[PDB]
Amino acid sequence: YGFSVPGLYECNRYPCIKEVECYVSRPTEKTVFLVFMFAVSGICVVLNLAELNHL
Amino acid sequence: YGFSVPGLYECNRYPCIKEVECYVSRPTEKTVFLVFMFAVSGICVVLNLAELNHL
């Protein structure tokens, strides 16, 4: 997923003719959610590594 | 105008986004009309040239 959800998409899949432009819903909220989940997962990883090192 | 009227057109003019496809009305009748008018004009040209040469 990367780190952001763009507000525009360029699509060239059948049956669409050549290239078409499509518009996403609530890109900013989804970006915030993505970043927050990444941060929480990183914290979990750090704590797990600390425990494993302690052992 | 050339010698034919194609049935499809590719248009990339503002405000159209990128490139779009458009469809023409009665391409075949227009092609026939174009060719017929060209032939008649050619006959007229030939006759006029013959007259001028005769002079």
Swiss-Prot record, chains A, B:
Query: The organism sits in which domain of life?
Result: Eukaryota
Membrane-crossing segments per the record:
33-55
Signal peptide range in chain numbering? none
All ranges on the Extracellular side of the membrane = 1-32
Expressing tissues: Highly expressed in neurons.
Q: Where in the cell is it found?
A: Cell membrane; Cell junction, Gap junction
Q: What does this protein do?
A: One gap junction consists of a cluster of closely packed pairs of transmembrane channels, the connexons, through which materials of low MW diffuse from one cell to a neighboring cell.
What is annotated about its quaternary structure and interactions? A connexon is composed of a hexamer of connexins.
What family does this belong to? Belongs to the connexin family. Delta-type subfamily.
What is the name listed in the Swiss-Prot or TrEMBL entry for this protein?
Gap junction delta-2 protein
Q: Which organism is it from?
A: Homo sapiens (Human)
